[PDB]
Each structure stands twice: as structure tokens, then as C-alpha cells.
Scaffold this active site. Sequence first.
Site, PDB file in Angstrom:
ATOM      1  NE  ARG A 101      26.180  40.077  52.550  1.00 35.68           N
ATOM      2  CZ  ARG A 101      25.471  39.175  53.209  1.00 35.68           C
ATOM      3  NH1 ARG A 101      25.356  39.267  54.524  1.00 35.68           N
ATOM      4  NH2 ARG A 101      24.898  38.192  52.535  1.00 35.68           N
ATOM      5  CG  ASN A 141      18.449  44.716  47.013  1.00 34.30           C
ATOM      6  OD1 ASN A 141      17.383  44.200  47.326  1.00 34.30           O
ATOM      7  ND2 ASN A 141      18.643  45.372  45.885  1.00 34.30           N
ATOM      8  NE  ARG A 148      10.240  50.235  45.464  1.00 29.39           N
ATOM      9  CZ  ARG A 148      10.615  49.997  46.719  1.00 29.39           C
ATOM     10  NH1 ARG A 148      11.744  50.493  47.184  1.00 29.39           N
ATOM     11  NH2 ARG A 148       9.832  49.298  47.516  1.00 29.39           N
ATOM     12  CE  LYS A 194      16.080  44.120  50.904  1.00 30.79           C
ATOM     13  NZ  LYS A 194      15.794  43.572  49.553  1.00 30.79           N
ATOM     14  CE  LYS A 246       9.519  45.239  49.795  1.00 35.04           C
ATOM     15  NZ  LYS A 246       8.980  44.705  51.066  1.00 35.04           N
ATOM     16  CE  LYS A 265      18.229  31.329  55.768  1.00 32.91           C
ATOM     17  NZ  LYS A 265      19.225  32.279  55.222  1.00 32.91           N
ATOM     18  CG  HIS A 295      15.386  41.944  43.791  1.00 31.18           C
ATOM     19  ND1 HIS A 295      16.496  42.036  44.603  1.00 31.18           N
ATOM     20  CD2 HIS A 295      14.371  41.685  44.599  1.00 31.18           C
ATOM     21  CE1 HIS A 295      16.133  41.804  45.855  1.00 31.18           C
ATOM     22  NE2 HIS A 295      14.858  41.589  45.884  1.00 31.18           N
TER      23      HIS A 295
END
EC number: 4.6.1.18
Length: 124
Positions: free
Chosen positions: A85, A44, A10, A41, A7, A66, A12
Site C-alpha cells: 500500500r 496491490n 503481471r 498504483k 494483466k 465488492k 498479482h
Amino acid sequence: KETAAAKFERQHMDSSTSAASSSNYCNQMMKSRNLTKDRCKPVNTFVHESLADVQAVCSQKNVACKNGQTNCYQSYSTMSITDCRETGSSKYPNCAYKTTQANKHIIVACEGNPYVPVHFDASV
């Protein structure tokens, strides 16, 4: 069922270009990586480096995530990335994105054997 490692790839990795060339990169890529299938989303990041370089970060500078966990790593060097974004006027299913090409450090969370990126935490 996609592994977390798969994942991550895919969502990043984009080792096919050196940088985003156009302002529509994010619109294009968010769609085709199927990051707009059920919902847009919101945020990313894509990394324009080899898979090997990105995987290598799991052996670099250990930092807090974080979320407080400590399985995060910062890349020693900057990497070519693109920040996607969702715009404020984006409405699913016509998802729309601002593209920002940059050279920044990446921070990822690493897990498993092999110990590989499973989450993108931030860029610096």
C-alpha cells in the site's frame, strides 16, 4: 493489448519467492511489474503460490464481489501473500510502499473460457 488474465498474472502473481523477506519488497516489485509507470498504483497484493493454485480458486467458494457481481471466489485455504500500500508521503514518480507479508485467504473475480482470475478483490 494484454488480456485481463495476463494483466492479473503481471499484477498479482509472484511464484518465485515463498514470502517477502524485506520491507522493500513492495517498492521493488511495484516498479518492476511496471505498476508505477504513469501513476503509483495505490494498493496491490502479490500471491506467493503456484499459478495453478491461484487459478484453482475459480473452482472453490463462490462469493459476492465488492461490486455486487457474483463471479468472485474465496480460496478454501490461506495463501502466502504480500500486501503493498502506497505510503501517505509517496509522490509520483518516487512511489513508496508499505510491505505486509501475511497468510490469508484470497478473493478473486473469474471470467472466460478457460475460467481464470481476472481481478483481485480482497484478502481475508
